[PDB]
Chains A and B, each alone.
With several copies, the nearest count.
Chain A
Amino acid sequence: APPAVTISASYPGADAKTVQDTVTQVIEQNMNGIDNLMYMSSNSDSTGTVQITLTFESGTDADIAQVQVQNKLQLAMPLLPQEVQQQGVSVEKSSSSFLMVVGVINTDGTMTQEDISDYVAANMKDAISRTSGVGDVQLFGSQYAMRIWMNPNELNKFQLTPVDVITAIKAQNAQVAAGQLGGTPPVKGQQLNASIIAQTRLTSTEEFGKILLKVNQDGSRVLLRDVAKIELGGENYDIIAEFNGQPASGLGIKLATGANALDTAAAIRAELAKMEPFFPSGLKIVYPYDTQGVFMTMVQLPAGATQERTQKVLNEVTHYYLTKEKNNVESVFAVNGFGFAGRGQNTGIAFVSLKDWADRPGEENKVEAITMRATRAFSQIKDAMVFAFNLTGFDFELIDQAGLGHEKLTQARNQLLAEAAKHPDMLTSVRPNGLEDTPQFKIDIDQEKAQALGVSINDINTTLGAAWGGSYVNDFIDRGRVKKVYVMSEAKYRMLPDDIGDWYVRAADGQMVPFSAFSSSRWEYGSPRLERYNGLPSMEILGQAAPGKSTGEAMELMEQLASKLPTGVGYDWTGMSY
């Protein structure tokens, strides 16, 4: 298989196009000077995430390819926004599938799903990350962060905005280098040498709560807890997991390309033994996926599907193995927010572990038959793709060759799909691999009205961005470990459009101005995930041949209806079609 290198970057609170037009394109335009590069693909999603996948020719040294891609991106780093840099970018050589999954549950029930995830990240992830041949570690959850949940009604009562919150957190959660007394060069006769310690980073919600935002004209003081709720919480709330229907976290372990499969695994098991003695009470390590014996179940919902609906499909899948195949299934580790492909609020995956091979006798109880029956039972779940598989059509890319745009490329894609549907004698299941457009909330800042009232645009864009998307301010120390501080609106005040007017920004003359005074909004349709192939906007289309015909004829046909597509629409083969 051709070695592949993936680049990962994230932009908190950014939509798909913002991410593509600020990160993806800039990285792609600097991927030159790379040897033996076959093709390049990328995704920019409304989660605020980019994954650029560069596939290299066979026989290429994956170490050299990663080094060359790592160095090129290092040069493109100053071209990316500060927010993307603060998140840290990753360049990883690895396969697409997992080598093993390390589950962590809590029998006592003293730790919830959120706490279990924070413990595994704060005490297990990094050491497993440095182990022999582990290329990619995926946390099924999120490490804790100092979450500031702002309330807009209290901020308006004290004439404050999220800009003041972010400014005060950076000032009062600082690690100050203050020098020394009697330091070098010293006056002669000096007998005292001592380090000066000014402000240290905060360590508790109590400390963050008494961050002084401002003092009023009558002497009373406004603390950060007077305008927000200070709690520990995850950096993101995208991914949550469950082991046999009970709260769980874990680590997805991918093998680094070229590493030995088993000896790696034993090394993970070795490091895990070093951790177990210092677990809190109730914490326990389970091994739900060890690469017969195991299989996976993919769950994909259409774009615009929430975690609630995805969780419903996962429960139905988990309930099937735990009830109608309990004689065969030992355990089920289910994750929502993470699918085989990547991340998504509409995706999920379930790692199914079987009982010992000897205890399941006959053809009817082995992984082949169990996956066939499971797929048959999940096939009638409405508005969801649910497949079960262990461990042959075509892979087609529709390319925007002349700067047409996303909307025009969508129409051309639908035109190719409609014509391919009229040939059931040839191609079946012709489908796009990406996502469809979803309603999005377009808001326009009136510059004239903003300037007439004396309201800065950056104050407006920070108030909107930090409240409704979240803002990574700086770092703090949680039990001796560096973690992030996040500023965001409490759930209450960022759920429905009328809440936009609840947010106030301070003008140059001290007047509090609501968002309704200088904004206007409308519903429209945009994309939740934007695909690119070889630097150009693209749309992946999957399909296969009809009963009893070779893909060559299949492929040849697809080429032909692509020729009748509008001017400026190209195409290219990728994957196993290349």
Chain B
Amino acid sequence: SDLGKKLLEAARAGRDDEVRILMANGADVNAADVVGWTPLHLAAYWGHLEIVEVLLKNGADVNAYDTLGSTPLHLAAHFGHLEIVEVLLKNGADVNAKDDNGITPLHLAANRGHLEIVEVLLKYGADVNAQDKFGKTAFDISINNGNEDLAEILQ
């Protein structure tokens, strides 16, 4: 869709007023680019909170995944966007979603030491015994990274 492309580039750039007119003009809420990223994906990746909110109100698929299995909750947990992680979980995002590598958002937050996000994820039912394709849990990530603050959160 021509509108869907203008929405993707507007969501990628954080233009909330252009995103609103595109929503009112009937643009595809779930238009995906070549890599499989929806407007919710890029707004979650680039930390545009209200674009994440406006999209979800207009029926955005909170659990859309790209060609490699990554959800908008994955990107938000990876890049320290704490407020976006909460609104995604509140709008029904799968806390235990796995990509093609069996990797969960808890792994991504633990890998980058996003402790505030780790607590919010486990508060919403994140499986802490979740293993990726190599059999590594979030606890193994804390031991390997040497992050002792996280290693006591997970216990």
Contact = CB atoms under 8 A, between A and B. Distances in A.
A210 B113 CA distance: 15
A522 interface: yes
Contact of A439 (B37, B74, B103): B37
A191 B34 CA distance: 7
Contacts of A523: 35-37, 66-68, 70
24 contacts: A192-B34, A194-B35, A209-B146, A210-B144, A210-B146, A223-B144, A225-B146, A414-B13, A439-B34, A439-B35, A446-B134, A448-B134, A449-B134, A497-B67, A497-B68, A520-B132, A521-B68, A521-B100, A522-B68, A522-B103, A523-B37, A523-B66, A523-B67, A523-B68
Interface of B: 13, 33-37, 45, 66-68, 70, 74, 99-101, 103, 132-134, 144-146
A269 B133 CA distance: 57
Contacts of A192: 34-35
Contacts of B103: 520, 522
A61 interface: no
Interface in A206-230: 206, 209-210, 221, 223, 225
B146 A206 contact: yes
A287 interface: no
A525 interface: yes
Contact residues of A: prevailing secondary structure: mixed
A456 B35 CA distance: 30
Contacts of A521: 68, 100-101
A210 B145 contact: yes
A225 B145 CA distance: 11
A518 to B, nearest CB: 8
A221 B103 CA distance: 21
Contact of B70 (A225, A446, A449, A522): A522
A523 B65 CA distance: 12
Interface in A493-524: 497, 520-523
A225 B144 CA distance: 11
A457 to B, nearest CB: 16
Nearest to A439: B35
B119 to A, nearest CB: 22
B134 A525 contact: no
A192 B68 CA distance: 14
Interface in A183-217: 191-192, 194, 206, 209-210
Closest 10 CB pairs of A and B: A520-B101, A192-B34, A439-B35, A523-B35, A446-B134, A210-B144, A449-B134, A191-B34, A523-B66, A522-B70
A191 B134 CA distance: 32
